[PDB]
C-alpha cells in the first residue's frame, strides 16, 4: 500500500545471440533457476500496492525451432516483436518476466528476454543473464546449483530506509534544492515544445562511429584531459551551440547504488539527475571539460538521492527539468560460455522524453556515439545532419586546440549556400531621388488625377505647380539643400504638398505629432534644429515659445509659376527624420537617406505594381514611417492619393465610409487595427466598402494567421505581411498573407518572409555566428536600405549600427528582434531580446518610462509593466496597457493622480501608464530579480438619466458592473480597439454620432455624457479658402449653404467658395417682411468680401432668386461673369405644389443629416415661404447659366420661355428639384461649372 497511481506498462526487451553448441532444455531450466534466485523479479501490484509475492512461480521458456523456416531470422524478429508490441498488464497476479529460446540455425540461437521496467534497467539485467549462464555452465561441468549472489528484497529496502533516515538524506536534499534553484531552463534540438512524460515506447536508435581520426588527434594533443570528460565537453558544447543557448539544463546518468551493491542488484539502479550547463564563449575546451568534470565530481557525492524525489519536493509541471540527457557510462554485456560467442542485441530500452546521447571513446582513441531520439520530435536524416555538425565540431578543435568555445562554427557547407541564395538581392537601381521620380511620372501623365481630399483635387501638373511654388517659398524663407523642415499639419492635401515641396528644395521633413507635450517637442526641435516649421495659424501659439525657429502658415494653394523640377535634391541628402523612443536618454531621430527610400519605393512598385486606375489611401499619421510610402509611392506609378479625415484612422466605420467614398484600391493596417476593423465588418458591409481593395499591407506587429484567413474569407482582397524597423527605411522583408502561402502556415503568426531589393537578412547567434534553420537567433539587417544613423548621437549610432563580419567595411543594424528561418527560407518573427514593446503598432521603450517615473519626486524606484488589465476586454489585437508601479523614498503616499498628470507633460500620451500603483516594497522573489507575476493588477457617483446607458455599455464591454460614475474607461481595462466598438455601440444607442476619438480625449462616464449629450453658423460659410477669384453661393430655403460642400472638389484649386446664409438669431430672412430687404442685406456682406472686380455667383431654389435679384443690382452699379441657377424658377410660376416642393427640400435637407437647437432650420423655411409669396423679379440685363431638372413639372414654356423676359444656356439632367443639388448631379454640374468659370 505504498503507491497511488498505477505504473506504466512499458518494458525493457533484448536478446542474446549465441553462436555455438547450446543445450536448450538445460538452458531453460537454468533460466527458471536464475529467475527464481532473485526475489525481486517476482513482484506484483494490487489495485494501489507495490509488493513482492514470494509464492509466484516461473515457467520454462518456450523453445521454438525455426531452422526449417524459409526465413528463420526474420521470423524470430517477428516473434520477439510480436511479444514486444503487446502492452503488459501490470495488475496481473503473474510474473512480469518473459524469456524465450529461438533456434535459427544448428549452432545459432536468439535468447529473447523481457522485463517490466520496475524490475530491471539497462545496467542490471546482464547480472541476471550472467547468473543464468553461470548456472548453465556449472551444470555443464557437473557441479551443483550455485547460490544466489543477488541481494534479497528485504536488505535493499533496509539499506534504502537507512539512507532515507540518514544524515546524508537532508544534505543531499539541500544540495539538489540549491541545484534546482540555480538550474537553467531546459533546451531541445527539436523546435517543438518539451512535452514532459512521453507515452511512445517506439523510439529511433542511431549508432555512429567516427573514423575521421579527429577525436584521436584532439585527445592526444590534450594529454591530461580524461577522454570521457573531453567527449562530454564536446557533447555539451555541441548541444549548446546547436540550440543557440549558453545556459541549458541537460540530464546526466548517475547510479543510486555503487560497488558490489550495484553489481549484485536486480532492481533499477540508474538515476538520471538534472545537470545545469553553462557555456563560456571565452573559454577553451580544456577549461570547459575541467569545470564540467569538477561539477560532476561534486554531483557524484549526492547521487544516491532519487530523482523522482527532486521532482516531488520541487511539481505540477508541465515542463520537465531537462530535455536532453548525456550518457558516458558503458554497460558490460559480455559473458564467457565455453566455445560459444554471445552478442547482446537491444530491442526496447523504453521511452525517451526528448533525446539521449551516449558517447563511447574506445581504447584505440576514436569516438563512437549512440543517439536515442523521439520518433515524434525527430527523424533520422536530421539526426545524421546534427551528427555531421558534431563531426566538424570535433575536427575544428582537433586542428586548433586553442580554439575558443565562442569561435566554433557548427553550420554546414550547404546552409551557407542557402543563405547566399536567399540574401542575393542585388538589383541595379538608378542614382535618383523622390523629386526626380515624381517629376518623371508627372511628365508622363499631367492631366491624370493625383492628390485629392474633401475640398481639393489636383492633377499631376497642378500638384507639381503647387510643390514647386511652395518649394520656392521655403527657399525664400532660407531653407537650403541639406536642411530640415518640421511639419505640424492636419491631414489634408497641404500635408502631402508640404512634404513633396520639402524634398523638392533638397531638405528633409521632420513630422511632428501635436498630441505630444511641449517639452518633448521642444527637445526634438533642439536636437534637429530645423530651418523652418510648417504649421497652421492655430498651432503657432504652441511654438511661439521655441527659440530660434522660423515659422510658416500653409493652408491654401499658391499662384502657379511653372512645373519644372528645381533639381536641388541629391541622393546623399536626408529624406526624412523620425524620432523614436530611446532606451537610455532623450528620444533619438532616425535619419533615412534618399537612396534608401528610393530603393524601398521602387521595389514596392515592382513587387506590387500600381496603375492609374489605382487609388491609394492616406490613413497613416505623418509621425509613422509607413506613411512615407503613402505620400510618394502612388506618385511614382501614376496612381491617385486621397486624404482621409483627421483621426479617422481610429474609426473603423469612418474607414468604411472612406474606402467606399473614394474606391480605395490600396491601403495599410496594423494587425491590431486590422482585428478592430474586421470586428466592425459584416459580409454586406465588407462587400459595400472593401470591394475595391486590391492590395492591403500589414506591418508593425506579428501578423496572426487566423486574422488573415478571416480577412480572406470576409473580403478576398490580397493581404501582405511586411517587416522592418524605422532604422531600415520603412520595411525590409515581405511575405504573402493570403491564399496558398497562408494555408501552409503552421505557426500562429505569418512569417516576415524574404528580403527586399539590395537588402540582406542575417540571423546570428550570441557569438555573431549564423544559426541553422529552426533555431532562434538575433536578427541583423544589411544593405542599401539602412538608415544614415541617429541624428547628432554618435554613441547610440555606433552602439546600434555595428560592424559587419560577412561584408567587409559595411555596417549592420541590430534590430533586437529574435527570429529564425524555416524550411522554405522564410524568416519567422519570434520576439524581442530587449525591453522594447510594440503596443498596438506603437514603438515603446520601457526603460524611458522607467527612468522618467523614477525621476519623479520622492520615488526610490519604479517599474513599468505592460499587462491585460481586464481579460474580458480581449476581442483580438493587442489589449495590453501600461501600468506603473512606484515605491516612495519616504514611505509616504505618493498621490499617483498628480504624478500621472505630471508624467503627461514629459512622455507621449500612449507612453503614459494608465494606472500608477504604490507598493510597500517592490515584489522580489528569489535572487531579487523582480517577479513580474507578483505584480498585482489594478482593481476592477451621479449616474444620471443619459449616462446610465453609458455605464451599461461599460459594464457590457468590460464585464465589470459599474455603479460609480466618474470612472476612467482605460483604468478599468479598456483600450483603443475596444473604445472603437464602444463608439459604434453608443452611436446606435444614441441619436448623436459617437466617435472613438471622443473616448480618447475624455475617458469617463460623466465626461463622455457631457460631450455626447465646425466651420460656423455665421453669415459667412468658408467652404474653401483659396487665393484667386471667389465663387459666392447663396443659401436655399433652408438658409444654410452647407449643401455646396461637394462642389468645391470639381472647381479649379485656385478658386475660393464662400457661401452666404441666414443665421436665424437676427438673420436677414426673418428681419425682412419685404423680400428685397434681404437681397440688399446680402450686399452688406458681399461688398465687404470683394468690393471691386467681376462677380461669380451661384444659387439654388430661393438662393437663385437671390442670385438674379443681386445680379441686376450689381449690373446697375461692376460686372457678373457667371451666375448659375440650379432648377430655379421665377416667383410668378401662394401656389399649392410649390409648398410640396419646399417640403421636399426641407425633408431631404434635414434627413441627410443625422444628429436640438437646430429648429432654426424650420424657421428659415417658414420665413422662406412668407417671403416667397411676395413676388420680386428684375429683367437682369446680363446673361447667366441655367441647369434644369428634366423630371420636374410640365408646361412646355419651361425656362427657355419662362426666363425669357429675364440670354441664357440650359443643361438638362434627369433628376427632381431636390436631386439637382445632390452629389450625383454635381458629378456632372461641377465639371460644367468649372469649364464655364475658366
Amino acid at each position: 500500500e505504498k503507491l497511488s497511481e498505477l505504473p506504466s506498462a512499458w518494458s525493457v526487451a533484448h536478446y542474446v545471440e549465441l553462436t555455438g553448441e547450446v543445450d536448450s532444455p538445460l538452458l531453460a531450466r537454468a533460466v527458471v533457476a536464475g529467475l527464481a534466485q532473485a526475489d525481486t523479479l517476482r513482484m506484483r501490484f494490487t489495485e494501489v500496492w507495490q509488493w513482492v509475492d514470494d509464492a509466484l512461480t516461473f515457467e520454462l521458456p518456450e523453445i521454438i525451432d525455426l531452422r526449417t523456416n524459409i526465413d528463420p531470422h526474420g521470423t524470430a524478429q517477428a516473434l520477439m516483436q510480436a511479444d514486444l508490441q503487446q502492452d503488459l498488464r501490470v495488475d496481473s497476479g503473474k510474473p512480469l518476466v518473459f524469456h524465450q529460446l529461438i533456434q535459427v540455425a544448428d549452432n545459432r540461437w536468439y535468447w529473447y528476454q523481457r522485463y517490466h521496467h520496475l524490475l530491471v534497467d539497462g545496467f542490471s539485467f546482464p547480472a541476471i543473464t550472467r547468473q543464468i549462464a553461470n548456472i548453465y555452465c556449472t551444470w555443464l561441468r557437473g557441479e551443483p546449483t550455485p547460490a544466489s549472489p543477488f541481494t534479497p528484497f528485504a536488505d535493499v529496502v533496509e539499506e534504502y530506509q537507512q539512507y532515507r533516515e540518514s544524515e546524508a538524506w537532508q544534505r543531499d536534499a539541500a544540495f539538489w534544492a540549491e541545484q534546482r534553484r540555480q538550474l537553467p531552463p531546459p533546451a531541445s534540438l527539436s523546435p517543438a515544445p518539451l512535452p514532459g512524460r512521453s507515452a511512445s515506447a517506439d523510439i529511433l536508435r542511431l549508432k555512429l562511429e567516427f573514423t575521421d581520426g579527429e577525436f584521436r588527434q584532439l585527445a592526444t594533443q590534450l594529454s591530461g584531459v580524461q577522454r570521457t570528460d573531453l567527449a562530454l565537453a564536446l557533447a555539451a558544447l555541441w548541444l549548446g551551440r546547436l540550440c543557440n543557448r549558453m545556459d541549458y539544463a541537460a540530464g546526466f546518468i548517475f547510479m543510486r547504488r555503487l560497488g558490489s551493491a550495484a553489481l549484485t542488484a536486480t532492481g533499477p539502479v540508474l538515476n538520471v539527475l538534472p545537470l545545469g550547463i553553462h557555456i563560456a564563449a571565452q573559454e577553451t575546451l580544456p577549461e570547459l571539460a575541467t569545470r564540467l568534470a569538477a561539477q560532476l565530481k561534486k554531483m557524484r557525492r549526492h547521487q544516491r538521492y532519487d530523482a523522482e524525489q527532486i521532482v516531488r519536493d520541487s511539481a505540477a509541471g508541465d515542463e520537465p527539468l531537462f530535455g536532453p540527457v548525456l550518457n558516458i557510462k558503458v554497460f558490460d554485456y559480455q559473458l564467457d560460455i565455453p566455445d560459444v560467442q554471445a552478442q547482446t542485441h537491444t530491442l526496447a530500452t523504453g521511452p525517451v522524453n526528448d533525446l539521449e546521447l551516449a558517447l563511447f571513446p574506445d581504447v584505440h582513441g576514436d569516438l563512437s556515439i549512440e543517439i536515442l531520439a523521439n520518433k515524434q520530435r525527430y527523424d533520422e536524416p536530421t539526426l545524421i545532419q546534427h551528427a555531421e555538425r558534431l563531426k566538424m565540431l570535433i575536427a575544428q578543435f582537433a586542428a586548433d586546440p586553442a580554439l575558443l568555445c565562442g569561435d566554433v562554427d557548427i553550420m554546414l557547407p550547404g546552409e551557407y549556400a542557402q543563405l547566399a541564395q536567399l540574401n542575393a538581392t542585388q538589383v541595379e537601381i538608378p542614382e535618383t531621388t523622390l523629386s526626380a521620380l515624381v517629376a518623371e511620372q508627372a511628365a508622363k501623365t499631367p492631366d491624370a488625377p493625383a492628390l485629392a481630399d474633401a475640398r481639393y483635387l489636383f492633377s499631376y501638373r497642378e500638384m507639381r505647380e503647387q510643390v514647386v511654388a511652395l518649394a520656392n517659398l521655403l527657399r525664400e524663407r532660407g531653407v537650403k539643400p541639406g536642411d530640415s523642415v518640421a511639419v505640424a499639419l492636419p491631414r489634408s492635401v497641404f500635408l502631402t504638398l508640404a512634404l513633396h515641396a520639402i524634398v523638392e528644395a533638397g531638405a528633409a521633413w521632420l513630422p511632428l505629432d501635436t498630441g505630444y507635450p511641449d517639452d518633448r517637442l521642444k527637445m526634438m526641435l533642439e536636437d534637429a534644429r530645423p530651418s523652418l516649421l510648417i504649421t497652421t495659424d492655430d498651432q503657432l501659439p504652441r511654438f511661439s515659445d521655441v527659440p530660434n525657429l522660423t515659422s510658416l502658415c500653409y493652408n491654401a494653394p499658391l499662384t502657379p509659376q511653372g512645373s519644372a523640377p528645381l533639381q536641388l535634391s541629391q541622393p546623399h541628402h536626408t529624406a526624412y527624420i523620425i524620432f523614436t523612443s530611446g532606451s537610455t536618454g532623450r528620444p533619438k531621430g532616425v535619419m533615412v537617406g534618399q537612396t534608401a527610400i528610393v530603393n524601398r519605393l521602387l521595389w514596392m512598385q515592382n513587387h506590387y505594381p500600381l496603375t492609374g486606375e489605382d487609388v491609394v489611401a492616406q490613413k497613416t499619421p505623418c509621425s509613422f514611417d509607413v506613411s512615407v510610402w503613402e505620400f510618394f509611392w502612388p506618385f511614382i506609378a501614376g496612381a491617385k492619393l486621397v486624404m482621409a479625415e483627421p483621426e479617422a484612422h481610429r474609426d473603423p466605420l469612418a474607414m468604411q465610409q472612406f474606402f467606399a467614398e473614394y474606391g480605395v484600391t490600396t491601403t495599410h493596417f496594423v494587425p491590431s487595427m486590422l482585428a478592430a476593423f474586421v470586428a466592425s465588418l459584416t459580409p454586406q458591409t465588407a462587400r459595400q466598402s472593401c470591394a475595391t481593395l486590391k492590395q492591403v499591407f500589414c506591418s508593425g506587429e506579428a501578423l496572426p494567421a487566423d486574422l488573415c484567413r478571416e480577412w480572406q474569407q470576409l473580403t478576398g482582397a490580397p493581404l501582405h505581411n511586411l517587416y522592418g524597423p524605422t532604422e531600415a527605411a520603412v520595411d525590409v522583408s515581405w511575405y504573402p498573407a493570403f491564399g496558398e502561402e497562408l494555408a501552409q502556415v503552421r505557426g500562429s503568426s505569418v512569417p516576415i518572409g524574404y528580403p527586399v531589393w539590395n537588402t540582406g537578412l542575417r540571423i546570428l547567434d550570441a557569438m555573431m555566428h549564423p544559426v541553422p534553420p529552426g533555431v532562434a537567433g538575433d536578427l541583423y539587417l544589411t544593405g542599401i536600405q539602412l538608415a544614415q544613423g541617429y541624428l547628432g548621437r554618435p554613441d547610440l549610432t555606433a552602439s546600434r549600427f555595428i560592424a559587419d563580419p560577412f561584408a567587409p567595411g559595411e555596417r549592420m543594424y541590430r534590430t533586437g528582434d529574435v527570429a529564425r528561418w524555416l524550411d522554405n527560407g522564410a524568416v519567422e518573427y519570434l520576439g524581442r531580446s530587449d525591453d522594447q514593446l510594440k503596443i498596438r503598432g506603437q514603438r515603446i521603450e520601457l526603460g524611458e518610462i522607467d527612468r522618467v517615473m523614477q525621476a519623479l519626486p520622492d520615488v526610490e524606484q519604479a517599474v513599468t509593466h505592460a499587462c491585460v488589465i481586464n481579460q474580458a476586454a480581449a476581442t483580438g489585437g493587442d489589449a495590453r496597457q501600461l501600468v506603473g508601479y512606484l515605491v516612495s523614498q519616504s514611505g509616504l503616499p505618493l498621490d499617483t493622480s498628480a504624478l500621472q498628470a505630471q508624467l503627461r507633460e514629459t512622455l507621449p500620451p500612449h507612453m503614459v501608464p494608465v494606472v500608477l500603483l504604490q507598493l510597500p516594497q517592490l515584489p522580489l522573489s528569489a535572487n531579487g530579480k523582480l517577479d513580474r507575476k507578483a505584480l498585482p493588477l489594478p482593481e476592477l457617483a451621479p449616474k444620471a438619466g443619459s449616462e446610465t446607458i453609458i455605464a451599461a455599455a461599460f459594464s457590457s464591454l468590460l464585464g465589470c458592473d459599474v455603479q460609480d460614475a466618474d470612472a476612467d474607461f482605460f483604468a478599468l481595462g479598456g483600450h483603443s480597439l475596444l473604445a472603437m466598438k464602444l463608439a459604434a455601440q453608443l452611436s446606435r444607442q444614441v441619436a448623436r454620432q459617437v466617435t472613438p476619438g471622443q473616448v480618447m480625449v475624455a475617458s469617463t462616464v460623466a465626461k463622455l455624457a457631457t460631450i455626447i449629450d465646425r466651420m460656423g453658423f455665421e453669415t459667412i460659410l468658408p467652404l474653401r479658402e483659396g487665393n484667386g477669384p471667389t465663387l459666392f453661393c447663396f443659401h436655399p430655403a433652408s438658409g444654410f449653404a452647407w449643401q455646396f460642400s461637394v462642389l468645391s472638389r470639381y472647381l479649379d484649386p485656385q478658386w475660393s467658395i464662400i457661401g452666404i446664409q441666414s443665421p436665424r438669431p437676427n438673420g436677414p430672412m426673418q428681419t425682412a417682411a419685404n423680400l428685397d430687404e434681404v437681397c440688399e442685406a446680402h450686399l452688406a456682406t458681399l461688398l465687404e468680401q470683394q468690393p471691386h472686380g467681376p462677380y461669380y455667383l451661384l444659387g439654388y431654389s430661393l438662393g437663385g432668386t437671390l442670385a438674379q435679384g443681386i445680379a441686376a443690382r450689381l449690373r446697375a452699379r461692376e460686372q457678373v461673369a457667371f451666375l448659375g441657377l440650379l432648377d430655379t424658377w421665377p416667383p410668378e410660376t401662394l401656389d399649392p405644389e410649390v409648398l410640396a416642393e419646399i417640403n421636399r427640400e426641407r425633408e431631404a435637407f434635414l434627413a441627410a443629416q443625422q444628429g436640438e437647437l437646430f429648429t432654426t432650420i424650420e424657421g428659415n423655411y417658414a420665413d422662406a415661404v412668407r417671403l416667397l409669396t411676395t413676388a420680386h423679379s428684375v429683367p437682369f440685363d446680363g446673361k447667366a447659366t441655367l441647369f434644369v431638372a428634366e423630371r420636374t413639372l410640365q408646361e412646355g414654356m419651361s425656362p427657355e420661355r419662362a426666363w425669357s423676359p429675364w440670354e441664357l444656356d440650359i443643361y438638362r439632367q434627369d433628376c427632381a428639384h431636390v436631386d439637382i443639388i445632390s452629389p450625383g448631379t454635381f458629378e456632372k454640374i461641377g465639371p460644367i461649372i468649372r469649364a464655364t468659370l475658366n
Binding site: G406, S799, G809
Partner: protein
C-alpha cells in the same frame, strides 16, 4: 530571452573604425571584422561608448566629406 552581448555592460568591448571613418563597438574576445580597424580604445561598454561620443564628431561618411 536572448539578452544580446551589446546590451550587456558586464562585458568589455573595443572601438573599431572602417574606411569611411564610421565608429562602432565590438566584443574584445572576438576578431575584428575584415575592413575594420581598432581606434585605440577598449574596456567597459559605457566607457567605449563615451569615447566614441567625443571622437566621432563629423557624422558624414568620409567619401562624402570632400564633396561637401
Amino acid at each position: 530571452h536572448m539578452t544580446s552581448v551589446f546590451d550587456r555592460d558586464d562585458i568589455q568591448f573595443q572601438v573599431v573604425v572602417n574606411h569611411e571613418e564610421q565608429y562602432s563597438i565590438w566584443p574584445e574576445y572576438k576578431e575584428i571584422p575584415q575592413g575594420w580597424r581598432a581606434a585605440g580604445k577598449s574596456g567597459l561598454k559605457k566607457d567605449c561608448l563615451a569615447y566614441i561620443e567625443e571622437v566621432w564628431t563629423d557624422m558624414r561618411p568620409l567619401s562624402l566629406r570632400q564633396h561637401m
